[PDB]
Design a protein around this ligand. Structure first.
Ligand SMILES: Nc1nc2c(ncn2[C@@H]2O[C@H](COP(=O)(O)OP(=O)(O)OP(=O)(O)O)[C@@H](O)[C@H]2O)c(=O)[nH]1
Ligand SMILES: Nc1nc2c(ncn2[C@@H]2O[C@H](COP(=O)(O)OP(=O)(O)O)[C@@H](O)[C@H]2O)c(=O)[nH]1
Ligand SMILES: Nc1nc2c(ncn2[C@@H]2O[C@H](COP(=O)(O)OP(=O)(O)O)[C@@H](O)[C@H]2O)c(=O)[nH]1
Ligand SMILES: [Mg+2]
Lengths: 39, 430, 50, 432, 430
């Protein structure tokens, strides 16, 4: 598991196409914060 | 995702990369500060192939800079897009090789290679999907010609199944900038033939003839030469980084261009090229693109492509166009010049189409050709080498650092056999 | 071969031996004299003053 | 409601304490004047005066007045209580006998009175942290005697000792081994957990990472301050796995004799190389267990492991923590003792590390501080004992101690006790 | 505040202290009228160490001058900065010594020491926490070598716990002044090993070679020698007077430099010393300081320190520097010269640092060392003593005031004794 890694913070768009990009995309679209809101 | 790591060594390779990375950066819309500012979403679509992301969203090239003297990187760091390069990857020597291949491959190299091999291992293991390696260097410079081929040997030792690509600036006798080219060039090529999956040769004199005749500009410069090389190289991997009608990656080219495991030396060309004064009259059409591509003088190598028969050819087009026109033009150029294609291999041209053209041009073409024409370069360098070696001039310097004439003899015999069996298939018939 | 402390010695003007050191020492004496002139602490300038 | 008491004895102890208090007052937003600009997570280290300013829960001891009065003239002169900056009259002069048998009693009574009065105002005393340099006369003697007094006055309360031992080859004084073994014996049965704080390892780390060729004590003290802050951030900030100060004496000490520990911190990167790096959880965990990253000059590959405590701060995620620790366990170069199948305590805090202006460290989002108990630490005791007995064989410098009122036999039982300790360390490592 | 007081006797000690007090007033910014016109607040928090405070805002040195002839005191009072010392601290005879130890130690010394003892006791009980004593004197004269050692014995039995430094100008055989020097030299030095906690030796011949080789000054006078002695002596107490990272007092020096109670003889040196020329032509860096400080011909003693082995050594760096560099230099210099350091004691070098460089300087080094080669001086002096004692020359001048050959016999016997136990550690192996 080497997720995150070569995909940093970005909002909207189709992304970078590495890792789980597809799965984070719909989460980010339906709700803000595709991955792990900052504390 | 089928990613490649950039490693460059020697002054020539450093200068080549200094503008190759600039071309990649402005094509992908990356500022010298590492912040993306492009307009098309396809720009970030496959940015993976050459970049890494650090915290804060900034991008860094996965290129490792190597040499035996720090002046080169001290110069290129102040240049444009010099801030992209990661400071840790810089590996430089303390003495210098002085264009002595034995020094650069046996004494200084055996000690220096540890850090560079460690860092390249780190880069390889960090990347998820490694496609292969690409290296830029010149066969006339000692430190490059030695330590680069040493790194070739070792990297191929731990990664036998991956593809590897070599960018060799082979010296021509007309424009000779150094005296000991025959020795270090033949020593480098002896090792390079055994371990190179792909090797493409570049001639500075051919570059200069192209820029003087086609571009018709009065004062050419190393900047323009580097720009030509960088554009040619971006053309190679545009198809791997952008969608198109028919994608064909590096392994695709390796399968479709190398008939026998040892004939893996190529000559390249780029199109279109027009002068600033005539650019408004030319109309960009596939027929004239192909006519310029298959021009003998447009090739970036000294070898006369009409002095031999093509083993195979490959053309990568960039931009939107009809593939039927491409195919019919390919058939026309094949059957019209059947004299210059060896007969026992029908349909010996690979054609690939990518839907994203270079910025500022609506269509572009890159050409890679495997032909018998390269034999004369090796014949002539062999003549220069034997002229050097009969009188044993400039030889005690090499042999005083662990070398002997046995290595020179075996290398020249190997390269002579290379030339002989390279020309063997030119006259072979079915 | 140049050796110092050679029996009879002339002034700094001749080049018999160890002339450079004494000449630059005298020069620094003048230089600090200039400094004592620059900063108004000269005993003479006090003497004519009172 | 929960807070600790800070003790700084010896010149090195006070010089590192002043830096760590700089760091803490900077982190909690308190200016050197002592009042919050206003433009309950500080009770651990500061207490309200009733209206406005605050005072730290720390006391400073030293026999020579130079450091104490120079701090009194420093910029923090309005921060500390004027009467808790205790200074003596005559320096101990690297002599354990002077600091333990002749001049200590005249100051330790006032010191313990100060400690009592400080504890009286508090309600949730968690323990004591003590900072001293062992290879120094006043430091070793006063720290030893204070630990002895506290062990009988309070008893069950936890005490953590961040001691600076002499380095293996690089050292300043010649007579350091004597008071080194004496202080080690004195603290062996009175310090709950001791932390190695040599200097040669810190020089190596700063020269290789920060690329500093002319470092001074300031960088070392700032690194130690960062270590302390990362260690104690859990008590005062919210996190997924909050860990109390008492969660060391229950997790890292298999036997009452073995309580000496050595640390590490990550990341260690300057400001120009930070923006070009990954700084992922797996990488920062891997960089922690490498043997040149260890905060003390000792090879961990020469011995087993008994207990490891890793504290993460920032946006750390237990998924990544577990993945990294699984990779570490898979890795072969690090091995644990058989009778310890599980040997890690992990803590998580949401507060990212704070950055001091003008410091060498850069602003970093993820960081981990690691504490390790290893049987390989017997190497430093062995080398120190050898340097001891080489010159003790012919009774050098022994008059300076015997004439101060110290009996000559203490060296024998000190030698025997450290010898028993080293048999303990070598015996625990055997397989069952 | 752990202060010290100064006692000086004889013409030599008078001159040494006279120039030392000028120097200390100089870097404390005190005018000859005793008024502070310094710039720093850092020159006043430790002013009580050496200067007492009096009415009118002035400061007075706590120094007491003793001798048998008022000529030297009349000269020093008329000399520059002569108004600092109080007239009450001058104790002088009206007869003189005549280079005879017996006159100064038995007849006139006993009857005159009462006043100096009273004044030193008064001034000592005046201060809050007295740190120790320091004496500057010569052993080749009568009045000094007699009254100084008598007062040392007296104050030692009066204050057993306090520490005492002495700065001893011993007679050099090469440059001689009196034909009776070795007698009173041996008689005085016989009484130091029982009282003085630290003795540090100085040779006028050594100072002459230093000034004529390194400083290269054509015609040096006693002012130069006195000034070098003053700078070297002043460098010792910088730690107790100025802030720094590593403070180290006289007691720390004693405990870290005394292996055994009868090995309290030291040899000292100063750096950086250079002639007028390269003073701005050469860079002052700690590697250069540590290279120059261990130079054998940099010594202020006729003893040549490369004929033996070092027991312990200590250096007191001044000015801002980095501790890691100091430690690595010390370690490297101890490693390259293992043959010159005794083996059964590890890490026999002490380093201290202070944050205030001297006047007009940015880095300075003061060195103290305990070496086995100092016994050569005692060998020569004992040889001369025995040689002119066997013929009983000039012994009547001594025996005419209650002295006998017996005490001479114990003096020379203890000399040979100390020589034996000081040389038998040279070959001692564990
Ligand atoms: N890392 C580090 N160590 C220090 C520092 N200051 C002192 N030390 C250590 O302290 C040892 C010497 O003792 P000091 O601290 O100088 O003096 P002390 O502990 O007060 O004992 P005394 O000298 O008798 O007064 C040295 O070997 C150093 O290792 C510091 O600022 N940083
Ligand atoms: N394309 C290109 N070729 C160069 C450049 N600089 C030098 N060369 C070629 O490199 C050859 C000399 O190589 P050298 O500098 O000795 O290689 P090195 O020893 O590895 O530094 C010459 O024949 C030049 O034609 C450059 O900036 N661009
Ligand atoms: N360095 C130095 N040495 C001196 C000075 N005055 C005298 N001496 C030395 O002291 C020796 C004579 O000592 P003396 O005056 O008889 O000692 P005293 O009788 O105790 O005063 C001579 O050999 C000189 O070299 C001085 O001002 N500085
Ligand atoms: Mg101290």
């Amino acid at each position: 598991t080497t997720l995150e890694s070569y995909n940093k913070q970005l909002q909207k768009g189709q992304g970078t196409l590495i890792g789980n990009w597809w799965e984070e995309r719909e989460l980010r679209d339906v709700t803000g914060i595709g991955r792990s809101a900052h504390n | 995702m089928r990613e490649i790591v950039h490693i460059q060594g020697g002054q020539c390779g450093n200068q080549i990369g200094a503008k190759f990375w600039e071309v990649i950066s402005d094509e992908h819309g990356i500022d010298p500060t590492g912040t993306y500012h492009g307009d098309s979403d396809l720009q970030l679509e496959r940015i993976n192939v050459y970049y890494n992301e650090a915290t804060g969203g900034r991008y860094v090239p996965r290129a490792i800079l190597m040499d035996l003297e720090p002046g080169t990187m001290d110069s290129v760091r102040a240049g444009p897009f010099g801030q992209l390069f990661r400071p840790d990857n810089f590996v430089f020597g303390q003495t210098g090789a002085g264009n002595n291949w034995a020094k650069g491959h046996y004494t200084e190299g055996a000690e220096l290679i540890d850090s560079v091999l460690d860092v390249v291992r780190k880069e390889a293991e960090g990347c998820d999907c490694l496609q292969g390696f690409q290296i830029t260097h010149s066969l006339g410079g000692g430190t490059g010609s030695g330590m680069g081929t040493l790194l070739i040997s070792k990297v191929r030792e731990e990664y036998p199944d991956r593809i590897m690509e070599t960018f060799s600036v082979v010296p021509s006798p007309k424009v000779s900038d150094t005296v000991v080219e025959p020795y270090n060039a033949t020593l480098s090529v002896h090792q390079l033939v055994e371990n190179a999956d792909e090797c493409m040769v570049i001639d500075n004199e051919a570059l200069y003839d192209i820029c003087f005749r086609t571009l018709k500009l009065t004062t050419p410069t190393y900047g323009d030469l580097n720009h030509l090389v960088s554009a040619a190289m971006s053309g190679v991997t545009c198809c791997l980084r952008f969608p198109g009608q028919l994608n064909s990656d590096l392994r695709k080219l390796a399968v479709n261009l190398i008939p026998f495991p040892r004939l893996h030396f190529f000559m390249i060309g780029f199109a279109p090229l027009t002068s600033r004064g005539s650019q408004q009259y030319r109309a960009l059409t596939v027929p004239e693109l192909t006519q310029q591509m298959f021009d003998a003088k447009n090739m970036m190598c000294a070898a006369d492509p009409r002095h031999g028969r093509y083993l195979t050819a490959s053309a990568l087009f960039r931009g939107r166009m009809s593939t039927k026109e491409v195919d019919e033009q390919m058939l026309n150029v094949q059957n019209k010049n059947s004299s210059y294609f060896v007969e026992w291999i029908p349909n010996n041209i690979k054609s690939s189409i990518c839907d994203i053209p270079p910025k500022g041009l609506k269509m572009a073409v890159t050409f890679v050709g495997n032909s018998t024409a390269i034999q004369e370069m090796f014949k002539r360098v062999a003549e220069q080498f034997t002229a050097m070696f009969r009188r044993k001039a400039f030889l005690h310097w090499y042999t005083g650092e662990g070398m002997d004439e046995m290595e020179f003899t075996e290398a020249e015999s190997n390269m002579n056999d290379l030339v002989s069996e390279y020309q063997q298939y030119q006259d072979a018939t079915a | 071969m140049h050796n110092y402390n050679v029996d009879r010695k002339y002034q700094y003007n001749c080049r018999i031996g160890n002339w450079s050191e004494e000449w630059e020492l005298d020069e620094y004496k003048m230089k600090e004299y200039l400094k004592n002139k620059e900063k108004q602490k000269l005993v003479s300038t006090d003497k004519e003053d009172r | 409601m929960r807070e600790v008491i800070s003790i700084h004895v010896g010149q090195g102890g006070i010089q590192v304490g002043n830096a760590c208090w700089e760091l803490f007052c900077l982190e909690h937003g308190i200016q050197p004047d002592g009042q919050m600009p206003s433009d309950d997570a500080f009770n651990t280290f500061f207490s309200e005066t009733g209206a406005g300013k605050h005072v730290p829960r720390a006391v400073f001891l030293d026999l020579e007045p130079t450091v104490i009065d120079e701090v009194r003239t420093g910029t923090y002169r309005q921060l500390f209580h004027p009467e808790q900056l205790i200074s003596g009259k005559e320096d101990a002069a690297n002599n354990f006998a002077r600091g333990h048998y002749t001049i200590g009693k005249e100051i330790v009574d006032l010191c313990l009175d100060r400690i009592r009065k400080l504890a009286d105002n508090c309600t949730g005393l968690q323990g004591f942290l003590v900072f001293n340099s062992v290879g120094g006369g006043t430091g070793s003697g006063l720290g030893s005697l204070l630990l002895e007094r506290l062990s009988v006055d309070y008893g069950k309360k936890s005490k953590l000792g961040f001691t600076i031992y002499p380095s293996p080859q690089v050292s300043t004084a010649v007579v350091e081994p004597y008071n080194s073994i004496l202080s080690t014996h004195s603290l062996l049965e009175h310090t709950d957990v001791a932390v190695m704080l040599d200097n040669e390892a810190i020089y190596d780390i700063c020269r290789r990472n920060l690329d500093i060729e002319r470092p001074t004590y300031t960088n070392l003290n700032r690194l130690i301050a960062q270590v302390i802050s990362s260690l104690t951030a859990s008590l005062r900030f919210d996190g997924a796995l909050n860990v109390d100060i008492t969660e060391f004496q229950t997790n890292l000490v298999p036997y009452p004799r073995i309580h000496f520990m050595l640390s590490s911190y990550a990341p260690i990167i300057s400001a120009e190389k930070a923006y070009h790096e990954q700084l992922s959880v797996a990488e920062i965990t891997n960089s922690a267990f490498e043997p040149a990253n260890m905060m003390a000059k000792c090879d961990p590959r020469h011995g087993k492991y008994m207990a490891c405590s890793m504290m993460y701060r920032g946006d750390v995620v237990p998924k990544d923590v577990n993945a990294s620790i699984a990779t570490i366990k898979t890795k072969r170069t690090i091995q644990f003792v058989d009778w310890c199948p599980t040997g890690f305590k992990v803590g998580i805090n949401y507060q990212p590390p704070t950055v001091v202006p003008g410091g060498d460290l850069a602003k970093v989002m993820r960081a981990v501080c690691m504490i390790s108990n290893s049987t390989a630490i017997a190497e430093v005791f062995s080398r120190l004992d050898h340097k001891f007995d080489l010159m003790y064989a012919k009774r050098a410098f022994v008059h300076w101690y015997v004439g101060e009122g110290m009996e000559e036999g203490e060296f024998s039982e000190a030698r025997e006790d450290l010898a028993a300790l080293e048999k303990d360390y070598e015996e625990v490592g055997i397989e069952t």
